[PDB]
């Protein structure tokens, strides 16, 4: 499962695009349990892919942007599934306004999973 989310995030930098400039609540800016963090991460990504799949600011105007938008949504939907698979419950409040670009939140999160993965390896 954690091996699987690392595998999804291996192709993170290829996904750093036009739409990754928009904001997201940085649930890493404001300490809770690991299951609470995963739940709050999985929530924010879902909120993003469902609010920007048809957003003009995400689709862009070039052909490259049309394709990159689609692939971003696919990448986020995938990532969200990995995260829920580690979150346990679905009840957690997003009691913070601390915005972050999606790009930053994903790098932040990638660092967090990489620490967890290097802590469970001997």
């Amino acid at each position: 499962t954690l091996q699987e989310i690392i595998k999804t995030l291996n192709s993170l930098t290829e996904q750093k695009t036009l739409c990754t400039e928009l904001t997201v609540t940085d649930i890493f800016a404001a300490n809770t349990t690991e299951k609470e963090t995963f739940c709050r991460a999985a929530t924010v990504l879902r909120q993003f892919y469902s609010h920007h799949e048809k957003d003009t600011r995400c689709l862009g105007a070039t052909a490259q942007q049309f394709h990159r938008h689609k692939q971003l949504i696919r990448f986020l939907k995938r990532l969200d599934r990995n995260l829920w698979g580690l979150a346990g419950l679905n009840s957690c409040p997003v009691k913070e306004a601390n915005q972050s670009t999606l790009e930053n939140f994903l790098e932040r999160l990638k660092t967090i999973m990489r620490e967890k993965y290097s802590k469970c390896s001997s």
Partner: antibody
Amino acid sequence: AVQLQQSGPELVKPGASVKISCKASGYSFTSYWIHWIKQRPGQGLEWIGMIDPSDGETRLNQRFQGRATLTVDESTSTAYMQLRSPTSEDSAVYYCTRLKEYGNYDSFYFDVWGAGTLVTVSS
Amino acid sequence: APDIQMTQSPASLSVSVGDTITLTCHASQNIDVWLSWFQQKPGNIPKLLIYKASNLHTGVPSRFSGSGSGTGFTLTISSLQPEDIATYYCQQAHSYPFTFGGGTKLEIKT
């Protein structure tokens, strides 16, 4: 290796619809968008539209005002283009092509092409 | 949103084996470096030569060369071979709908 096999020539009456196939082989069919291109002697090459074999999403050139319908059968790896209300103006060689991409659309181009299909629309 | 119009010049050109030739392509709007070149031999199908204004497709001989960014673009055939007598088209991938030039037909000098 990678191939796109198109269907044979068509002789159509006006108002009668026409449907051509494009059968992909030698690669994961669902990985790239299939595009359809029109070629008339006077004109040159015209982009009709495209279809995503992974989900059936379709984008068409406004110039084909719901004239061309694009479909896929991923069970047989086949792309289709249906032209409704064809007229003399629709007589052309219709090509299907795949838009190969690298590094998540860093580079994207029409690398492989089908042999074309002559559609003759009777006067 | 208006379609990006692609213009090629000359419409045709007489040529001999050994010649160094340069065909022109112009975009009515900025297309960055999103430009491909195709060769179409009489009665045959379009074949990609160059993608992204200057990158050669695998298998395409080095005598073919591309240049440009923005709106002005070029194709060069150095030491033109008999195989190279064809019609050449450019195609922009900046925006949907994708658009092609009218072509440049190469004709052999008799």
